[PDB]
Design a protein around this ligand. Structure first.
Ligand SMILES: Nc1ncnc2c1ncn2[C@@H]1O[C@H](COP(=O)(O)OP(=O)(O)O)[C@@H](O)[C@H]1O
Ligand SMILES: Nc1ncnc2c1ncn2[C@@H]1O[C@H](COP(=O)(O)OP(=O)(O)O)[C@@H](O)[C@H]1O
Ligand SMILES: Nc1ncnc2c1ncn2[C@@H]1O[C@H](COP(=O)(O)OP(=O)(O)O)[C@@H](O)[C@H]1O
Ligand SMILES: Nc1ncnc2c1ncn2[C@@H]1O[C@H](COP(=O)(O)OP(=O)(O)O)[C@@H](O)[C@H]1O
Ligand SMILES: Nc1ncnc2c1ncn2[C@@H]1O[C@H](COP(=O)(O)OP(=O)(O)O)[C@@H](O)[C@H]1O
Ligand SMILES: CN(CC(=O)O)C(=N)N
Ligand SMILES: CN(CC(=O)O)C(=N)N
Ligand SMILES: CN(CC(=O)O)C(=N)N
Ligand SMILES: CN(CC(=O)O)C(=N)N
Ligand SMILES: CN(CC(=O)O)C(=N)N
Ligand SMILES: [Mg+2]
Ligand SMILES: [Mg+2]
Ligand SMILES: [Mg+2]
Ligand SMILES: [Mg+2]
Ligand SMILES: [Mg+2]
Lengths: 368, 368, 368, 368, 368
C-alpha cells in the first residue's frame, strides 16, 4: 500500500560524533535529508558516497576526504555536498565559480634537478577515467573488464621507448607481485581502508593489471583505484626528465585511447574526474622519496609542509609509516593549478626543504 | 529512491496488552504483517478496520467486536481476520464453510404475544446497505448524499398504512430531536465510542435523517450507522403484529429501492453486509423493553442471558445503563439463523425470563 | 474504464450554512474545487484538513480556526486556503509577504512581576515538531513511537536543575493521571472536540507521555497535540523567572535534539510549524491564572480582552468554563511577534487588567 | 487524487421502465454493474452497445434487439449480456453450447418457384465484415475508407455475368439516388432509428457506395449498416435462380477479398459477425414481395407469421408500412440454421401463405 | 533488474578509420554518445540514420553524404549531426541561422536554349514527401501503400496535356521495365549502394510505380527513393520549355494532392524534407546529357565542375560511368537557392562548358 511510511531521513543519519574527515565536517542533517532521495542514473546514492568516510573516522597519517564517486554524474548530482568538500580539500578553489586549466609542457619546467644525495627517487603520476563506464567503487565485473580491454588495446600501440607489455595481476605469481610492490612499481594489495570501505576491492584481482615499458620507467596501473593511473618513475633527482617522459607518454596514451572512440571523463569546472575528490583537476601527484639522514633532523616538519602545500607520506605506500627517515613528499592540491605549476611548486618546496638541512646552521624560517 | 526502507509491519503493530475485544483476541503479528499491505479498491485498509477496537479496549456494558468494514470488499479482502471474529461473535457460524439463509414469513411465528405487565414495548430492526456506495466509516459527503437521495426517492413510493414523511436531521430543532430520542424513535447523538472511533460521525448531521410513517410505527434511519435501518415499533407486547408489519414494510422498501436500479449489499456466505461484523447475516434485532418492578429481582442474570443467547442493554440505547429495572433484551446472534427463527428464539427466551420471575417461588433453572 | 465519471467537486462541498469558524468563513466553492485534487507527499488531503472545522461549527468558549495540518508540506500545498486563515487568525500578519523573527532573551523582559493577590500562577508554553515525521493528525503508530523515542533519548541528557524523568501515560495509574491533571501539569484526557474530530486521539494512550523535572517546574508533553510541548510553570506571579527557565530549558532541549541528527519543522515565512494554524510562528502561549475575588467584578471584559489581544479561557482547560472568577488569560497571537515581545505584551495586558477592576473607583478605559 | 470517488454503476443505470426491446428485457442492475468497467481493445463500452436500445423503446413495426457491436471483440467481451439476447432473438439457439454450420449449395434447394401472380419479386441478402476493422457503429473515417478501398479493389476482379461497376454515394445526384431507392436497389437515406441512435450515420455519405452488375441482379452495399451487404435480386418468383446467382457471386467475392490478405469476421460459435445481433450466423435474409390484391384478405396474420418464423416488413424497407397489401416476408432467424435450410424454410412458409391466401374456401390452419 | 548495465555508447561507436563520407567526417564520439539515446516518435534512431554511411566508405563516382532520414522529425531530433552535414553539403548554407526561399516562375528564366549539337537531352526533377507518413528508409508496407494510393488518386485529376496513366512496377513485364530504364524514363533496379544499405529496397517492387503522360514528357516516380519524384524530360537543349512544363505540372500536382487533405513535408528552415540531406531545400536537379565528341577533350574537368558547383554523373544513373564522353551534368546544391536561380546557374555553367570545348583554341579559364 502507498499509505505505508518510510524511515525519516534523520533515522538514517550517520553518527559522526567522533569522526575527523571532511565529509563528517561538512555533512549536516539538512544536506543529508535533501540528498538522501537523489541518485545517479547508474544507481549511485549518497550513502554509498559517504560510506568510506562513515566507516573510517581516523586513518592516519593524513587527513582523508571520506567520500568517493561512483560515476561522472555523482559530482553533479550530489554537488551540494561535494562542492564544499572539494573547496576545503583544494585550499579555496571554488568549483561553482572558477574553472580549471591544464597544460602539459615540461619546457616551462626549467631547472628541477634535485640533490642526488637527498632524494633517491622521483615520480610523477596522474589518473584517468573512461567516459561511460562506472568508477571502481561502483563498476561491475563487465565494466571493469571493458575498461581493461580498452586500455590494453590502446596501449598496444605504444612504440619506441614507450613500447611495453601488459601483465595481468591474476596471472603473476605471488613472488613477482611482492617483488614489484617492494620495488615501488606495482600497487599494494587491497588493504587500504579507503579501498576496502569504498568497495574498490571487489572481485580482486580480476581485471586488474600493470602495463609497463621494458625499462620500467613508464607504467600504467589498470583498475586499482582509478580506471587508469599513468606513472613515470626514475631512481634519482632528475624531475625534469621524468616529467618530460610523463608528458609525452600521457599524450600518446590519450591519442591512442581516443582513436578507438573512447573519451576521458572531463569537464572544465572540475578537470579530470576521478574517484576520490582529492584527485580532481589534474589528478597529478609529483613527488620524491627523500634521504633518511638529515631530514631525520627536522622537528617542526608539519607546519612547514602545510605552509608549502606539500603532503608527506611514509615510505612506499600512503598507508605505511616512514622508516629510517625516508619520506615520500609530494604536492597536496591538484585542482585549480596546472601540471607545470604543480611540478614547479613541488620542485620549489623540495628545494626549500633541502636548504633547511641545518646540520651546520640553526633556525627554520617556515616561510608561509 | 527505491533503496529507502519502510517501517517494518511489527513497528506499526498495535499495543493490545490490556484490550478486551474480539479483534484484540484474534489479532496476531503474523496476521497483521500479512494484511498490512492489502487494501480494498476504495482504499480501505486494515488499520482503518481495527482503529475502533484499538482505541476502545473496554466499552461496557457488552462485549464489542472492535472492527468495522469500509465497503463490501472489506469482508473479502481482510477475510483472514474477519472470519475468526465473525465465527466467535456468532457462536460458531463458519463463514468459510456454511451458508446463510433468509426467510421473512410472519405466518410461521405463531404465538408471540408477551405479558403486557412485563414488556411495555416491542421493537424489530434490520439494516441495509446500498451496493456500490462506501459504508459510513469510509463514505465521503457525496456518497452519503447519494445514499440519502436514493433512499428518500424510493421511500416516497410507500402507500397506505406505511405512507410517511422524511425528516432531515439538519432541519429539525434541538427540541424535536430530543423529544424523538427520548421517545426511543430517533437515533441518539453521535457520542457512541464505536461511532466516533470508527469515523461514522464525520460531517454530522449532514445527510442523516429519519423517515417515519404517520403512526410512527414504521421508521427508517438514514445514514446513522448503516446506510439504512428499518425499524418497526409498538408500545406493547404484541411481537406478532410488529414482525408482520416489519416484514411487509421491508419487502415494499426493497422492491421500491430495486425499482430504480439499486441493489443491496448481499452474498449468500455472509447474508446482508453491514458495517459492524456483529450485524451480518439477517442484521435483525428483535427485542422488548422489560418490566421495572420484577426483573429487578434477578441475581444470576448474565449466565441465563448468555445461555439463552440474549443480549441485555440499558434502556434508551446500548451506551446507557438500565435504570429502574427496565432492560432492552434482544437476540445476540444474527448470522446463520433466519429472521423467523431469531424472532421465535427471542420470544422463547423472553417467555423463559417471565417464567423465571418467580416472586412466589424460588430457584432458577438456568436451563442451557 | 477511463470513461467513468467522478463526483464533481461541488458534490463533495461541505454544508457550512451554520458554521462559525475561520475555515467556514474563508472556504468557497472555487477554492475547494481548486484544491480537492491536491495532496501532500504523505497523502494528506484538503478534506482531512477541514474535517475538524466541518464537524465543529461552534465550540465555545473561543473562536476556532477549524483546520489542522497533517505534515509540513500541508501549509505549502494548501496555502491558497491556509494563508487567509492564518492572516485573519493572527491579526493581519501576511505569510505570503512578510517574514517571522524569533528571539528568546530573558534579559530584555525586565519587570514582569505580577501582584500575588491577583495571579496565583504563571505559565509559558511552546510547541515543536520533528522534521520528517507526520503530525499527530496524520501520524501512524510507528511515527508516533519514533517521535517518543527521539524526544526521550534527547531529554535524557538534561542535567542539573532541569534534570528529570519521563512518565509514560500507558504506565501510570488513573489516580496519578487525575492528580497530575487536577494540578494543571498533565494534559487532559482526549475529549477536546478538535482533538477527536481532527484524529489526534487515535491509539490513545499509546506513545503519549510527560517528561518533567523533579520540582515539576519544567515539563514536556509528548504526543498530545503536537510532537512536543515545552512548558515552564510556577505557582506565583514571577513571570520573569518562569520565562528565564523556559528559555534556557528550550535552548538545551533544542541542542540535545539536534545532536542526534533531528531538526525541528521551521521556515522563516511561518516560523515553527505546528498542527493548529493558531500556534504557528513562535507557538508561544504565556499566561496566568487570576484571583477569584477581584476580576469577577468585570462587566465589559470581552471588548477589553480583544483590544489587548488577550485570550480568556476558563480555569485549567480551554474546553472548561471559568469557575469562581478565575480566568486563564494569555496572548492571542503567536505569529509575527517574537517571544520577548509576546511575553511583554502579556505582562502589559495583565497589568492593565489589574489596574482596571476597581472596587474603589469606577469607569473602564478599554484603551484600544 | 486517488481518494476521489466515481459515480456508482447504479447511478448510470438506464431508465427502462417503458422499453420494449430485448436489451431492456435482459438487462439487470447486476449485469450492468458487472460489465460497466469492461471495454473492447478499440474502446467500445457497454453504454455504446445499449445506446440504441435505450433511446428506442418502441420502433414499429417489428421487435428490435436494441443492441449493436462496435467490433469483433464485443460479442466476447460483453457475452454475459449478448448471449441471452442472441438466444432469445434466434428462437433458442445457445451460443455458449452449440455451434453454427454454413453451407451454400444451390443444388439441394430444389423447387423454389413461387406463383408469379403473388410474389412479383424475390431477393436474397447477406452481410460481411472485414476482420481487423471496426464496425460501422464505431468505425472512424479512416477505417471506413479502408473498408471501401478493400471492397472496391476486390470487386474489380469480378468477371463475366457478375462484372459490374462501383458508384460512390457522394458522387451521384439526388435524382439518381432517389430512383435507385424507389427501385428497391439502393439503401435508404440515413433515417432509420437504429442507424441514427447507434451512430452508423456519422460522416454520411462519405465512403458509402453501391457496386452493382450491369443487369443489376447482383449488388453490394458498401458501408451502410455492415461493411458489405451482398444482394441478389430478381423480379418474379424464381427463388432458385436468385439463390444460385447469390451463392456463386458470394463465393467469388469471398475469394477475391481473401486474395489480398483480408479475411472476414467469423467464429464457429456465432458464424459471421455483424453489427446487429439479429444478423449473426449466416446473416442471410431471403424474402419476397407479395401480392397486393389477395394477401390484404388475411386477418390472423401475425400468429401465422410467428409460427412460421417469418418476419413481415413493409414494402420499401423495414421502417416503412405495407401499402396496398404488398408485404416483404422473409425468414426471422439467421443463426443456427444453414443458408440452404433458411431458403427452404422461406419457400415453405411462402407456399403455405399462398395456399392459405386462396379465399375460395374458409378456415386458416395456423399449423405451428 | 535495474542494476544491469548497458553497453557504453563508445562500445557501439562505428569504426570509420577509412571512410570518406560527410557523416564520417562530422561524427565524433561526443556527438554519438549524446544522440545515441534519442529517437524520433516513429522509432528512428541515430544508428539507422548513419547505417548507409557506415556501410559505404567509398561509393564512386561522387562524394556521398552517408546519412538518411526516417521521417520529418529526424532532421529536428538529430539536428546536432545533420546541421553540420547539411552546411558542408550545401556550400555554406546554415540551417540553424538562415531560411530557405522557393519560387517556381518560368518567366524570369529567359534564354536557356543550349546548343543542340552538344546536349541531346534536358531534364528537371524534384522530390516530395507526404506529411504524416514515414520516409522510404523507415516506411512499412502499409505506409508505402498509403503513399501510393494518395499519389495515384491525386494524379488521376491531371487533365489536358498533363493527362497520363499510372503503371505499377509489379504489373509490368521485365522487357517493359528494361525498355523504360534504357530510355532514361524509369528508375533503375534496386542496386544502388545507398538504396540497399539505407533499407529503401524492402518489399521491392511492392507499391512502387511510374505515372507518366502520353508524350512521356511528364513523369512521376512513386516510392523509389522519395515518396514522389516529379520529372520533366525532353530530348534537346530546350531547357526553358522543360522548366515551364515542370513548373505548371508541379503546381497542379501539389494542388490536387492538397485537395484531399494531404500536405507535403516542409519547413522554412530546410525547405522540402526528403530522405537524403543532399536533396533538401528545393530538391531540384536540373541537368543535361552532354555531347560525346568534344567534351571528351576536357582535361582539368573536375576543378571546373567544382568551381561551377556542377556535379557530373556518368550516363543514365549516378551509379554508372560515363560511356563515350556523354555526361549528366547538373547542379550540385539544392538548398539556399530558389528553383529559378538553380536552373539559371545550370544554364550558365553548361554554356561555360560549351564555350570551353576549345576544339579550335587553347586554354581553360577555370573561372571560379
Ligand atoms: N617518489 C617515489 N619514488 C618511488 N616510489 C614511489 C614514489 N612515490 C610513490 N611511490 C610508490 O607508489 C606506490 C603507491 O603510493 P600511493 O601512496 O598509493 O601514491 P598514489 O597516491 O599515487 O596512490 C607505493 O608502493 C610507492 O612505492
Ligand atoms: N424494545 C424497544 N423498545 C423501545 N425502544 C427501543 C427498543 N429497542 C431499542 N430501542 C431504542 O433504540 C434506540 C437505539 O438503540 P440501539 O441499542 O442503538 O439499537 P441498535 O441495536 O439498532 O443500534 C434507543 O433510543 C432505544 O430506546
Ligand atoms: N496560567 C496557568 N497556570 C497553571 N496551569 C495552566 C495555566 N495555563 C494553562 N494551564 C494548564 O494547561 C492545561 C491545558 O491548557 P490548554 O488550554 O490546553 O493550554 P494549551 O493551549 O497550552 O494546550 C490545563 O490543564 C491547565 O491546568
Ligand atoms: N423481395 C424483395 N423485392 C424487392 N426489394 C426488396 C425485397 N426485399 C427487400 N427489398 C429492398 O431492400 C431495401 C432495404 O430493405 P431492409 O428492410 O433495409 O432490408 P435489410 O434489413 O436487409 O437492410 C428496401 O428498399 C426494399 O425495397
Ligand atoms: N539529362 C538527362 N537526360 C535524360 N535522362 C536523365 C538525365 N538526367 C538523369 N536522367 C535519368 O535519370 C535516371 C536516374 O538518374 P539519377 O542519377 O538517379 O538522378 P536522380 O538524382 O534524379 O535520381 C537515369 O536512368 C537517367 O537516365
Ligand atoms: C588516501 N586517499 C584518500 C584521500 O586522499 O583522502 C586516497 N584517495 N588515496
Ligand atoms: C455497540 N456496537 C458494537 C458491537 O456490536 O460490537 C454496535 N455495533 N452497535
Ligand atoms: C482550542 N484549539 C483550537 C484553536 O486554537 O482554534 C486548539 N488548537 N487548542
Ligand atoms: C431493424 N433492425 C434492428 C433489429 O433487427 O432488431 C435492423 N438491424 N435492421
Ligand atoms: C547518390 N545519392 C547519395 C548522395 O546524394 O549523397 C543519392 N542520394 N542519390
Ligand atoms: Mg594509492
Ligand atoms: Mg444503535
Ligand atoms: Mg491544549
Ligand atoms: Mg436495412
Ligand atoms: Mg536516383
Amino acid at each position: 500500500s502507498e499509505r505505508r511510511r518510510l524511515y525519516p531521513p534523520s533515522a538514517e543519519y550517520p553518527d559522526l560524533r567522533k569522526h575527523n574527515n571532511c565529509m563528517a565536517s561538512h555533512l549536516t542533517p539538512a544536506v543529508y535529508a535533501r540528498l538522501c532521495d537523489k541518485t545517479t542514473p547508474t544507481g549511485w546514492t549518497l550513502d554509498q558516497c559517504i560510506q568510506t568516510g562513515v566507516d573510517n573516522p581516523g586513518h592516519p597519517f593524513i587527513k582523508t576526504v571520506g567520500m568517493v564517486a561512483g560515476d561522472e554524474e555523482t559530482y553533479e548530482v550530489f554537488a551540494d555536498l561535494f562542492d564544499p568538500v572539494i573547496q576545503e580539500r583544494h585550499n579555496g578553489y571554488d568549483p561553482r565559480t572558477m574553472k580549471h586549466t591544464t597544460d602539459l609542457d615540461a619546457s616551462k619546467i626549467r631547472s628541477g634537478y634535485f640533490d642526488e644525495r637527498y632524494v633517491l627517487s622521483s615520480r610523477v603520476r596522474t589518473g584517468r577515467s573512461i567516459r561511460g563506464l562506472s568508477l571502481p567503487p561502483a563498476c561491475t565485473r563487465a565494466e571493469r573488464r571493458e575498461v581493461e580491454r580498452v586500455v590494453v588495446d590502446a596501449l598496444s600501440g605504444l612504440k619506441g621507448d614507450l613500447a611495453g607489455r601488459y601483465y595481468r595481476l591474476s596471472e603473476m605469481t605471488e613472488a613477482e607481485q611482492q617483488q614489484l610492490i617492494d620495488d615501488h612499481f606495482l600497487f599494494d594489495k587491497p588493504v587500504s581502508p579507503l579501498l576496502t570501505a569504498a568497495g574498490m576491492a571487489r572481485d580482486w584481482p580480476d581485471a586488474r593489471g600493470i602495463w609497463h615499458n621494458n625499462e620500467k620507467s613508464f607504467l600504467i596501473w589498470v583498475n586499482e583505484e582509478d580506471h587508469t593511473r599513468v606513472i613515470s618513475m626514475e631512481k634519482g633527482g632528475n624531475m625534469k626528465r621524468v616529467f618530460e617522459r610523463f608528458c609525452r607518454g600521457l599524450k600518446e596514451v590519450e591519442r591512442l585511447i581516443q582513436e578507438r572512440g573512447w573519451e576521458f571523463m572531463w569537464n572544465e569546472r572540475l578537470g579530470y574526474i576521478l574517484t576520490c575528490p582529492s584527485n580532481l583537476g589534474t589528478g597529478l601527484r609529483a613527488g620524491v622519496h627523500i634521504k633518511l639522514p638529515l631530514l631525520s633532523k627536522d622537528s617542526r616538519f608539519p607546519k612547514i609542509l602545510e605552509n608549502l602545500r606539500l603532503q608527506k607520506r611514509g615510505t612506499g605506500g600512503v598507508d605505511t609509516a616512514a622508516t629510517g627517515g625516508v619520506f615520500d613528499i609530494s604536492n597536496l592540491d591538484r585542482l585549480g593549478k596546472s601540471e607545470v605549476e604543480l611540478v614547479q611548486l613541488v620542485i620549489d618546496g623540495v628545494n626549500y626543504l633541502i636548504d633547511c638541512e641545518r646540520r651546520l646552521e640553526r633556525g627554520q624560517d617556515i616561510r608561509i
